[PDB]
Short mmCIF file of C-alpha atoms in Angstrom, two decimals:
data_model
loop_
_atom_site.label_atom_id
_atom_site.label_comp_id
_atom_site.label_asym_id
_atom_site.label_seq_id
_atom_site.Cartn_x
_atom_site.Cartn_y
_atom_site.Cartn_z
CA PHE A 287 -3.37 51.47 -11.93
CA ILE A 288 -6.17 50.13 -9.60
CA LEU A 289 -8.72 52.90 -10.05
CA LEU A 290 -8.49 52.69 -13.74
CA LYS A 291 -10.59 49.33 -14.36
CA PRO A 292 -9.70 48.64 -18.07
CA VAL A 293 -5.67 48.54 -17.72
CA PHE A 294 -6.01 46.54 -14.59
CA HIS A 295 -8.69 44.26 -16.12
CA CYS A 296 -5.82 43.30 -18.86
CA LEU A 297 -2.62 43.30 -16.66
CA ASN A 298 -4.11 40.85 -14.06
CA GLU A 299 -4.82 38.37 -16.89
CA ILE A 300 -1.02 39.02 -18.23
CA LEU A 301 -0.14 38.03 -14.71
CA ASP A 302 -2.17 35.04 -14.75
CA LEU A 303 -0.91 33.67 -18.15
CA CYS A 304 2.51 34.11 -16.77
CA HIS A 305 2.20 31.95 -14.00
CA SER A 306 0.59 28.85 -16.07
CA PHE A 307 3.53 29.74 -18.69
CA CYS A 308 6.49 29.04 -16.20
CA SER A 309 4.84 26.03 -14.87
CA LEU A 310 4.10 24.68 -17.93
CA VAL A 311 7.52 24.95 -19.54
CA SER A 312 9.30 23.48 -16.29
CA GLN A 313 7.17 20.04 -16.54
CA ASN A 314 9.02 18.63 -19.67
CA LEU A 315 12.24 19.99 -20.84
CA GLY A 316 12.02 17.39 -23.53
CA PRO A 317 9.09 17.85 -26.28
CA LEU A 318 5.75 18.75 -25.07
CA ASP A 319 3.38 15.94 -25.82
CA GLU A 320 0.55 16.42 -22.96
CA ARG A 321 -0.83 19.27 -25.34
CA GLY A 322 1.36 22.05 -24.21
CA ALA A 323 2.17 23.02 -27.62
CA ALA A 324 -1.52 23.40 -27.76
CA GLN A 325 -1.57 25.85 -25.14
CA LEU A 326 1.55 27.69 -25.99
CA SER A 327 0.01 28.97 -29.30
CA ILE A 328 -3.10 29.99 -27.69
CA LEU A 329 -1.31 32.03 -24.99
CA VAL A 330 0.99 33.54 -27.29
CA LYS A 331 -1.83 34.91 -29.56
CA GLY A 332 -3.85 35.66 -26.52
CA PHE A 333 -0.77 37.60 -25.28
CA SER A 334 -0.66 39.59 -28.18
CA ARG A 335 -4.41 40.24 -28.30
CA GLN A 336 -4.36 41.51 -24.80
CA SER A 337 -1.28 43.79 -25.18
CA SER A 338 -2.67 45.47 -27.93
CA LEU A 339 -5.83 45.96 -25.96
CA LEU A 340 -3.80 47.77 -22.97
CA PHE A 341 -1.86 49.57 -25.48
CA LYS A 342 -4.85 51.14 -27.06
CA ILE A 343 -6.35 51.66 -23.54
CA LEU A 344 -3.03 53.63 -22.27
CA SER A 345 -3.45 55.59 -25.53
CA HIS A 346 -6.21 61.43 -16.47
CA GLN A 347 -2.95 60.83 -18.92
CA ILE A 348 -0.33 60.97 -16.19
CA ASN A 349 3.13 61.61 -17.94
CA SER A 350 4.68 58.54 -16.48
CA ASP A 351 2.02 55.91 -17.92
CA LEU A 352 2.55 57.48 -21.23
CA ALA A 353 6.04 57.70 -20.74
CA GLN A 354 6.59 53.96 -20.38
CA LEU A 355 5.10 53.12 -23.88
CA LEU A 356 8.21 55.00 -25.80
CA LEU A 357 10.63 52.38 -24.07
CA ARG A 358 9.01 49.71 -25.71
CA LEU A 359 8.00 51.50 -29.12
CA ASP A 360 11.88 52.48 -29.59
CA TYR A 361 12.26 49.69 -32.05
CA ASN A 362 8.54 50.56 -33.63
CA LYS A 363 7.29 47.21 -33.36
CA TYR A 364 4.04 48.71 -31.28
CA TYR A 365 3.99 50.72 -34.07
CA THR A 366 2.27 48.09 -36.33
CA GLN A 367 0.35 46.67 -33.22
CA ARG B 158 25.82 35.14 -4.31
CA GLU B 159 29.58 35.11 -4.29
CA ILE B 160 31.60 35.06 -7.33
CA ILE B 161 34.88 33.24 -8.03
CA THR B 162 37.43 34.95 -10.36
CA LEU B 163 40.19 32.49 -12.20
CA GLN B 164 42.94 34.10 -14.40
CA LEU B 165 45.39 32.37 -16.51
CA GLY B 166 47.99 33.44 -18.91
CA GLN B 167 50.74 35.96 -18.24
CA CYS B 168 48.69 38.97 -19.88
CA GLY B 169 45.91 37.39 -17.87
CA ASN B 170 47.83 37.37 -14.57
CA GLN B 171 48.93 41.11 -15.32
CA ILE B 172 45.48 42.42 -15.91
CA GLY B 173 44.04 40.44 -12.96
CA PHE B 174 46.84 41.94 -10.48
CA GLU B 175 45.96 45.37 -12.12
CA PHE B 176 42.22 44.88 -11.41
CA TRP B 177 42.80 43.87 -7.93
CA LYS B 178 45.14 46.88 -7.49
CA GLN B 179 42.00 48.92 -9.09
CA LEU B 180 39.62 47.42 -6.37
CA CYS B 181 42.08 48.24 -3.46
CA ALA B 182 42.38 51.57 -4.43
CA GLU B 183 38.55 51.41 -4.89
CA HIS B 184 37.41 49.50 -1.57
CA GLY B 185 38.34 50.73 2.14
CA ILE B 186 41.52 48.79 2.42
CA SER B 187 45.24 50.18 2.53
CA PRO B 188 47.83 48.69 0.13
CA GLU B 189 49.14 46.33 2.53
CA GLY B 190 45.34 45.11 3.01
CA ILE B 191 44.66 46.42 6.44
CA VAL B 192 41.36 48.52 6.81
CA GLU B 193 40.83 52.03 6.63
CA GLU B 194 38.27 54.00 8.51
CA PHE B 195 37.57 56.60 6.29
CA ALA B 196 34.54 54.63 5.19
CA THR B 197 27.80 51.67 1.09
CA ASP B 198 29.93 49.04 -0.32
CA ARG B 199 30.21 45.39 -0.17
CA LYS B 200 33.54 43.57 -0.15
CA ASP B 201 31.75 40.01 -0.13
CA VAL B 202 31.22 39.07 -3.71
CA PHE B 203 34.99 39.61 -4.74
CA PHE B 204 36.64 39.53 -1.39
CA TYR B 205 36.83 36.55 1.16
CA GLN B 206 36.30 38.21 4.68
CA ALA B 207 38.30 36.59 7.74
CA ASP B 208 39.54 39.05 10.70
CA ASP B 209 42.60 38.89 9.60
CA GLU B 210 42.40 42.68 8.68
CA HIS B 211 43.69 41.50 4.97
CA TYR B 212 40.67 40.78 2.91
CA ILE B 213 41.88 38.04 0.56
CA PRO B 214 40.39 38.67 -2.96
CA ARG B 215 38.65 35.65 -4.18
CA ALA B 216 41.10 34.60 -7.23
CA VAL B 217 42.51 31.63 -8.21
CA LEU B 218 46.27 32.08 -9.41
CA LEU B 219 47.43 29.42 -11.87
CA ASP B 220 50.27 29.37 -14.25
CA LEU B 221 52.71 27.44 -16.17
CA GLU B 222 56.33 28.04 -15.56
CA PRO B 223 56.10 31.50 -13.51
CA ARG B 224 58.12 34.41 -14.97
CA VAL B 225 56.28 37.38 -14.68
CA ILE B 226 54.82 36.07 -11.12
CA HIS B 227 58.07 36.49 -9.33
CA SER B 228 57.41 40.20 -10.35
CA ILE B 229 53.91 39.71 -9.02
CA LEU B 230 55.73 38.80 -5.72
CA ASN B 231 57.87 41.79 -5.54
CA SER B 232 55.18 44.25 -4.69
CA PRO B 233 53.23 45.75 -1.54
CA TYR B 234 50.26 43.61 -2.51
CA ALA B 235 51.91 40.07 -1.53
CA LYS B 236 50.10 40.46 1.82
CA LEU B 237 46.83 40.94 -0.14
CA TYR B 238 46.94 37.32 -1.37
CA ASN B 239 48.81 33.81 -0.59
CA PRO B 240 46.34 30.87 -1.14
CA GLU B 241 49.39 28.81 -2.43
CA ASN B 242 48.24 27.69 -5.99
CA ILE B 243 51.08 28.71 -7.96
CA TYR B 244 52.42 25.66 -9.98
CA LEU B 245 55.18 25.12 -12.70
CA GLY B 246 52.72 25.16 -24.20
CA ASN B 247 52.82 26.47 -27.67
CA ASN B 248 49.72 25.62 -29.11
CA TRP B 249 46.09 24.75 -28.44
CA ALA B 250 46.53 20.95 -28.32
CA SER B 251 49.92 20.77 -26.23
CA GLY B 252 48.32 23.30 -23.79
CA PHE B 253 45.05 20.96 -23.83
CA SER B 254 47.39 17.98 -23.15
CA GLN B 255 49.46 19.56 -20.61
CA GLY B 256 45.92 20.73 -18.97
CA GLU B 257 44.63 16.96 -19.04
CA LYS B 258 47.40 15.47 -17.24
CA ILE B 259 47.38 17.69 -14.28
CA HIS B 260 43.66 18.15 -13.89
CA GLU B 261 43.24 16.38 -10.29
CA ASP B 262 45.51 18.98 -8.50
CA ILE B 263 44.20 21.84 -9.86
CA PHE B 264 40.90 20.89 -9.40
CA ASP B 265 41.23 20.49 -6.13
CA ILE B 266 42.53 24.08 -6.02
CA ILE B 267 39.21 24.68 -7.58
CA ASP B 268 37.24 22.32 -5.12
CA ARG B 269 39.43 24.23 -2.22
CA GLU B 270 37.55 27.57 -2.74
CA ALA B 271 34.31 25.82 -3.34
CA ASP B 272 34.09 24.34 -0.17
CA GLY B 273 35.71 27.58 1.41
CA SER B 274 32.59 29.80 0.75
CA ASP B 275 28.71 28.33 1.23
CA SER B 276 27.21 30.59 -1.50
CA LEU B 277 28.44 30.45 -4.99
CA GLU B 278 27.01 32.45 -8.24
CA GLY B 279 29.56 32.30 -10.91
CA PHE B 280 33.02 32.01 -12.27
CA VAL B 281 34.81 34.84 -14.26
CA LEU B 282 37.69 33.38 -16.58
CA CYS B 283 40.28 35.97 -17.02
CA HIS B 284 41.73 34.69 -20.23
CA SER B 285 43.45 35.64 -23.57
CA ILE B 286 42.57 34.05 -26.63
CA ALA B 287 45.15 31.93 -28.56
CA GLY B 288 47.86 33.37 -25.99
CA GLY B 289 50.09 30.46 -25.90
CA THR B 290 50.00 29.28 -22.14
CA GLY B 291 46.57 30.40 -21.72
CA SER B 292 45.07 28.88 -25.03
CA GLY B 293 44.21 25.06 -24.46
CA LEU B 294 44.61 25.19 -20.54
CA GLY B 295 41.59 27.71 -20.24
CA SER B 296 39.48 25.95 -22.76
CA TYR B 297 39.93 22.41 -20.92
CA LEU B 298 39.16 24.02 -17.40
CA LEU B 299 36.46 25.90 -19.21
CA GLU B 300 34.75 22.87 -20.23
CA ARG B 301 35.30 21.05 -16.86
CA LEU B 302 33.88 23.69 -14.71
CA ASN B 303 30.74 24.09 -16.75
CA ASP B 304 30.40 20.10 -17.02
CA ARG B 305 31.21 19.80 -13.20
CA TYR B 306 28.68 22.66 -12.11
CA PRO B 307 25.64 23.03 -14.26
CA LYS B 308 23.81 25.50 -11.40
CA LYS B 309 26.37 28.35 -11.79
CA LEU B 310 27.30 31.25 -14.23
CA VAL B 311 30.22 31.32 -16.37
CA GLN B 312 31.47 34.73 -17.56
CA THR B 313 34.82 35.32 -19.50
CA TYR B 314 37.07 38.55 -19.84
CA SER B 315 38.88 37.96 -23.08
CA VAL B 316 40.92 39.84 -25.72
CA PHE B 317 40.89 39.14 -29.22
CA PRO B 318 44.63 38.65 -31.00
CA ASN B 319 44.45 40.66 -34.03
CA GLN B 320 47.32 42.13 -35.45
CA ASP B 321 46.54 42.14 -39.30
CA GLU B 322 48.84 39.23 -40.26
CA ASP B 323 53.50 36.58 -36.95
CA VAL B 324 52.08 33.15 -35.40
CA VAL B 325 50.63 30.69 -38.06
CA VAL B 326 48.57 28.65 -35.66
CA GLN B 327 46.35 31.31 -34.32
CA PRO B 328 43.27 30.66 -36.32
CA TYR B 329 42.99 26.93 -35.43
CA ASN B 330 43.49 28.09 -31.58
CA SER B 331 41.10 30.71 -32.01
CA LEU B 332 38.67 28.27 -33.76
CA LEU B 333 38.77 25.79 -31.03
CA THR B 334 38.49 28.20 -28.12
CA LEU B 335 35.40 29.83 -29.81
CA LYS B 336 33.74 26.87 -29.98
CA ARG B 337 34.46 25.96 -26.27
CA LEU B 338 33.50 29.53 -25.37
CA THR B 339 30.05 29.32 -27.38
CA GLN B 340 29.34 25.61 -25.86
CA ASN B 341 30.87 26.03 -22.46
CA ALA B 342 30.14 29.46 -21.35
CA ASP B 343 26.92 31.37 -20.84
CA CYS B 344 28.16 34.71 -21.64
CA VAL B 345 31.43 36.30 -23.41
CA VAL B 346 32.72 39.85 -22.73
CA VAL B 347 34.90 40.50 -25.90
CA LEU B 348 37.60 42.96 -26.41
CA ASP B 349 40.17 43.19 -28.84
CA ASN B 350 43.81 44.61 -29.08
CA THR B 351 43.31 46.44 -32.16
CA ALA B 352 40.84 49.16 -31.17
CA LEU B 353 42.25 49.74 -27.98
CA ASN B 354 45.37 49.94 -29.33
CA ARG B 355 43.72 52.57 -31.80
CA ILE B 356 42.15 54.57 -28.94
CA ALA B 357 45.66 54.68 -26.99
CA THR B 358 47.52 55.79 -30.03
CA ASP B 359 44.55 58.80 -30.51
CA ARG B 360 44.81 59.74 -27.08
CA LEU B 361 48.78 59.27 -26.34
CA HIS B 362 51.83 59.26 -28.15
CA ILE B 363 52.48 55.72 -27.94
CA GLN B 364 53.95 53.40 -30.64
CA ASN B 365 56.22 50.86 -28.27
CA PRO B 366 55.15 50.64 -24.52
CA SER B 367 51.58 50.07 -25.40
CA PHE B 368 50.87 47.27 -23.37
CA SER B 369 51.26 49.01 -19.93
CA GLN B 370 48.83 51.70 -21.26
CA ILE B 371 46.05 49.13 -22.84
CA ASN B 372 45.97 47.25 -19.36
CA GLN B 373 44.88 50.34 -17.67
CA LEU B 374 42.34 50.87 -20.11
CA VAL B 375 41.31 46.99 -19.51
CA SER B 376 41.25 47.74 -15.93
CA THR B 377 39.11 50.70 -15.77
CA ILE B 378 36.44 48.76 -18.09
CA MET B 379 36.21 45.50 -15.72
CA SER B 380 36.20 47.90 -12.68
CA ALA B 381 33.16 49.92 -14.25
CA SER B 382 31.45 46.60 -15.27
CA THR B 383 31.13 45.60 -11.70
CA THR B 384 30.41 48.69 -10.26
CA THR B 385 27.08 47.79 -10.28
CA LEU B 386 27.43 44.30 -8.45
CA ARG B 387 30.01 45.90 -5.68
CA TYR B 388 27.79 48.86 -5.02
CA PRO B 389 24.38 47.74 -4.35
CA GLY B 390 21.92 48.97 -7.14
CA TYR B 391 18.35 47.41 -7.78
CA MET B 392 18.52 46.53 -11.35
CA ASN B 393 21.10 43.59 -12.55
CA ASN B 394 22.93 43.74 -9.44
CA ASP B 395 23.31 40.27 -9.53
CA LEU B 396 24.97 38.41 -12.35
CA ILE B 397 22.02 36.36 -13.16
CA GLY B 398 19.52 38.96 -13.89
CA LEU B 399 22.31 40.81 -15.72
CA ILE B 400 22.99 38.31 -18.29
CA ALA B 401 19.22 37.21 -18.55
CA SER B 402 18.34 40.51 -20.26
CA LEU B 403 21.24 40.58 -22.68
CA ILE B 404 20.81 37.31 -24.50
CA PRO B 405 18.12 37.38 -27.20
CA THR B 406 19.30 33.94 -28.71
CA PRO B 407 21.29 31.29 -26.85
CA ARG B 408 24.22 31.38 -29.49
CA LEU B 409 24.50 35.02 -29.14
CA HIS B 410 26.28 35.91 -25.81
CA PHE B 411 29.09 38.44 -27.00
CA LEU B 412 28.80 41.71 -25.25
CA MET B 413 29.93 45.39 -26.99
CA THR B 414 31.94 47.44 -24.34
CA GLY B 415 32.19 51.14 -24.35
CA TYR B 416 33.34 54.21 -22.12
CA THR B 417 32.55 57.48 -22.37
CA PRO B 418 35.76 58.92 -21.11
CA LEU B 419 38.03 58.47 -24.13
CA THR B 420 40.69 60.44 -22.05
CA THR B 421 41.01 61.47 -18.17
CA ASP B 422 44.88 61.83 -18.33
CA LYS B 423 28.81 69.85 -16.79
CA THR B 424 27.01 67.23 -18.47
CA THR B 425 23.45 66.24 -18.93
CA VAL B 426 22.25 62.71 -19.96
CA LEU B 427 21.48 63.42 -23.87
CA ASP B 428 25.22 64.58 -24.26
CA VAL B 429 26.81 61.51 -22.42
CA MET B 430 24.09 59.34 -24.47
CA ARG B 431 25.11 60.70 -28.14
CA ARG B 432 28.45 60.71 -27.34
CA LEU B 433 28.12 57.19 -26.04
CA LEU B 434 26.63 55.93 -29.29
CA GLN B 435 29.33 56.98 -31.27
CA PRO B 436 31.91 54.49 -32.55
CA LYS B 437 34.82 56.09 -31.47
CA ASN B 438 33.75 55.88 -27.89
CA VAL B 439 33.23 52.16 -28.39
CA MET B 440 36.20 49.92 -27.48
CA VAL B 441 35.16 46.79 -29.93
CA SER B 442 35.92 46.90 -33.84
CA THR B 443 26.11 45.22 -45.92
CA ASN B 444 23.82 45.97 -42.81
CA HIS B 445 25.54 45.39 -39.38
CA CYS B 446 23.58 46.61 -36.45
CA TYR B 447 23.04 45.60 -32.98
CA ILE B 448 19.93 43.57 -31.65
CA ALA B 449 19.71 44.96 -28.00
CA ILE B 450 21.76 47.56 -26.18
CA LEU B 451 21.87 47.98 -22.45
CA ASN B 452 23.57 51.19 -21.23
CA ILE B 453 24.94 51.93 -17.37
CA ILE B 454 25.08 55.29 -15.97
CA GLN B 455 27.63 56.29 -13.06
CA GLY B 456 27.50 59.85 -11.89
CA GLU B 457 25.63 63.10 -10.69
CA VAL B 458 22.33 62.18 -12.68
CA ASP B 459 19.02 63.77 -12.54
CA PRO B 460 16.38 61.06 -12.97
CA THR B 461 14.25 63.12 -15.15
CA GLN B 462 16.83 64.08 -17.39
CA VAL B 463 17.27 60.37 -18.44
CA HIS B 464 13.94 60.20 -19.71
CA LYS B 465 13.96 63.12 -21.90
CA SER B 466 17.73 61.94 -23.26
CA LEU B 467 16.00 58.46 -24.34
CA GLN B 468 13.45 60.49 -26.13
CA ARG B 469 15.92 62.43 -27.85
CA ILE B 470 17.58 59.61 -29.25
CA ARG B 471 14.05 58.14 -30.07
CA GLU B 472 13.97 61.70 -32.14
CA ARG B 473 17.15 61.84 -33.70
CA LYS B 474 16.83 58.55 -36.02
CA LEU B 475 20.16 57.20 -34.47
CA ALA B 476 18.10 54.11 -34.41
CA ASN B 477 18.79 52.83 -37.82
CA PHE B 478 18.72 49.12 -36.53
CA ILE B 479 16.16 46.63 -37.04
CA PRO B 480 16.00 43.26 -35.30
CA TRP B 481 12.69 41.35 -35.36
CA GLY B 482 11.86 41.68 -31.89
CA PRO B 483 10.79 44.53 -29.81
CA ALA B 484 13.33 44.19 -27.27
CA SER B 485 15.09 47.49 -26.85
CA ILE B 486 17.37 49.97 -25.75
CA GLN B 487 18.23 49.60 -21.95
CA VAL B 488 19.16 52.36 -19.47
CA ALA B 489 20.28 51.64 -15.98
CA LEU B 490 21.59 54.14 -13.09
CA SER B 491 24.17 53.53 -10.59
CA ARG B 492 26.13 55.78 -8.42
CA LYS B 493 29.42 57.33 -8.80
CA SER B 494 31.91 55.61 -6.05
CA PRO B 495 32.98 57.86 -3.31
CA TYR B 496 36.39 57.13 -1.14
CA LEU B 497 38.70 57.82 -3.91
CA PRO B 498 39.78 60.78 -6.03
CA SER B 499 37.26 61.00 -8.85
CA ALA B 500 37.85 63.19 -11.97
CA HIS B 501 35.23 62.99 -15.01
CA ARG B 502 32.20 62.75 -12.40
CA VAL B 503 29.94 61.48 -14.94
CA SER B 504 30.76 58.30 -17.16
CA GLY B 505 29.26 55.80 -19.08
CA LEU B 506 28.75 52.17 -19.88
CA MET B 507 27.66 50.04 -22.65
CA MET B 508 26.67 46.22 -22.87
CA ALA B 509 25.48 45.57 -26.20
CA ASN B 510 25.01 42.51 -28.82
CA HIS B 511 26.27 43.73 -32.04
CA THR B 512 26.83 41.78 -35.11
CA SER B 513 29.95 43.70 -36.54
CA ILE B 514 32.34 41.06 -34.76
CA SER B 515 31.05 38.35 -37.05
CA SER B 516 33.30 39.93 -39.71
CA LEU B 517 36.24 39.70 -37.09
CA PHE B 518 35.32 35.75 -37.00
CA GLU B 519 35.05 35.16 -40.56
CA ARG B 520 38.56 36.73 -40.93
CA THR B 521 40.06 33.64 -38.82
CA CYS B 522 37.49 31.65 -40.75
CA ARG B 523 39.13 33.12 -43.95
CA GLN B 524 42.80 32.57 -42.61
CA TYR B 525 42.60 28.88 -41.08
CA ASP B 526 40.85 27.70 -44.58
CA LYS B 527 43.79 29.05 -46.55
CA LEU B 528 46.14 27.42 -44.37
CA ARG B 529 43.96 24.35 -44.49
CA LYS B 530 44.23 24.15 -48.61
CA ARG B 531 48.30 24.63 -47.94
CA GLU B 532 48.75 22.08 -45.17
CA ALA B 533 52.29 23.40 -44.28
CA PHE B 534 51.02 25.73 -41.07
CA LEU B 535 49.82 23.17 -38.65
CA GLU B 536 53.64 22.93 -37.39
CA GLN B 537 52.90 19.03 -36.83
CA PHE B 538 53.40 18.49 -33.03
CA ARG B 539 53.77 15.41 -31.64
CA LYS B 540 50.90 15.60 -28.85
CA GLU B 541 48.94 17.48 -31.30
CA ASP B 542 48.83 14.37 -33.64
CA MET B 543 48.18 12.03 -30.86
CA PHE B 544 45.33 14.22 -29.59
CA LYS B 545 43.45 13.94 -33.05
CA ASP B 546 45.50 11.83 -35.65
CA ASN B 547 43.00 13.30 -38.55
CA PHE B 548 42.37 16.67 -37.46
CA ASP B 549 38.47 16.58 -38.02
CA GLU B 550 37.77 18.18 -34.81
CA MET B 551 39.15 21.41 -36.08
CA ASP B 552 36.96 20.93 -39.37
CA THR B 553 33.92 19.95 -36.65
CA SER B 554 34.53 23.49 -35.20
CA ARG B 555 34.90 25.05 -38.39
CA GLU B 556 31.10 23.60 -38.94
CA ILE B 557 30.01 25.23 -35.63
CA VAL B 558 31.22 28.41 -36.15
CA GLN B 559 29.76 28.28 -39.73
CA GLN B 560 26.58 27.69 -38.41
CA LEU B 561 27.36 30.53 -35.91
CA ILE B 562 28.00 33.16 -38.60
CA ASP B 563 24.78 31.78 -40.51
CA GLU B 564 22.84 32.32 -37.13
CA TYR B 565 24.37 36.00 -37.11
CA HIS B 566 23.30 36.54 -40.51
CA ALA B 567 19.88 35.58 -39.87
CA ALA B 568 19.58 37.44 -36.50
CA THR B 569 20.99 40.75 -38.49
CA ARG B 570 17.26 40.79 -40.48
CA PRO B 571 13.94 41.19 -39.16
CA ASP B 572 13.18 37.43 -40.29
CA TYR B 573 13.81 35.11 -37.51
CA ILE B 574 10.81 32.99 -37.53
CA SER B 575 12.76 30.50 -39.78
CA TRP B 576 16.16 29.28 -38.32
CA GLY B 577 19.31 30.50 -40.22
#
């Protein structure tokens, strides 16, 4: 998925937010007062945004990339996304 | 890394011995222990490897007043193990105090195999809940190996005592041990006697000698649950990645178990998945429903059929379950084992978080409460009175399991944005 530029152009940002998230939570195992909660809310809202954008991009059309969707959508929580 | 197993209780020592018998039939060794040249497989996570040609299983064999361990000696597997750890009550508190007074030498036995191997991953506790000799002592060592080592994983093999009402002290014991499993274990594999007895009466004609049959059923389960670790798969072939997928909430770590051959004494994947979802092929006994399921396959499985099969359950409306997250049903594939006679080639597993078991818990939370009103069924043991003079630790454990029941009842609904 490197020739298809939109899905690549959002999955890279999913990978960018993950490193920041795991580095952020490891600093304080107690409460977060270095404005980490401020970035946590921003990160979860931006993650929901980017995930819905890539879900619209996936919906070429190889059976594998469309096939991945139904595993996560078994619960139908990408049903309202 | 390597995983150390600890078995206590007479029933626990029996099923551990039968489990090692099943793995000696599995692995490339003889019943004396000597290597067979017919054999892919790894014998390192459960077997210490010398060159004494008798690979010693990584089991810690502790006991109180050995009776059935003599029957363990009179066997051809007495050359499989001799780590010299056999040492000579009735309640949770008496067994807890008896485990308290001798903690140094049994913990020296623990430190022995801890220093024996260099890599360490997990401790499996083979234990029966409210079993007498197992209860108290097992909860004590459970507290101690979690307190001493916070970098390792704690798994438990545990059966549930249910006889439909006799032991009057069992709800106290199970209540305290459930507190200790929730706070001193990261994952618990839960079984009960009643559903396996029901399935055993379904397949065979048995009423009295049930114990000898259900042990075989349990051992088939515990070998099956370890086939993905002993034979190299690529998904959850370590304990840590396996448990990391199964816990959506840190109070919920109890795993439902099933097995698709109900009797063993052609198939496509949608068939065994649909047979798998049935409650009769399940081994553990308002709307109550799964949070997340992992199913593991073992057999001659074509890869594209599993995708169609998962699509089939999606179209069936067999998914009448609805938690609050998109964490979904899970398929995994491992191979069927070679090197032994293998009948019923394709067989299944499930590892699932189901809240129906909370009903089982509240039955204990019913019974103790009734006895708490009567105050004639605590049996007033002297070490029990000295260990707790007011018996408020059982009340605090009742408070903790009541919060556990409320968290279960919140986890059932799609509304867990607030704490339950």
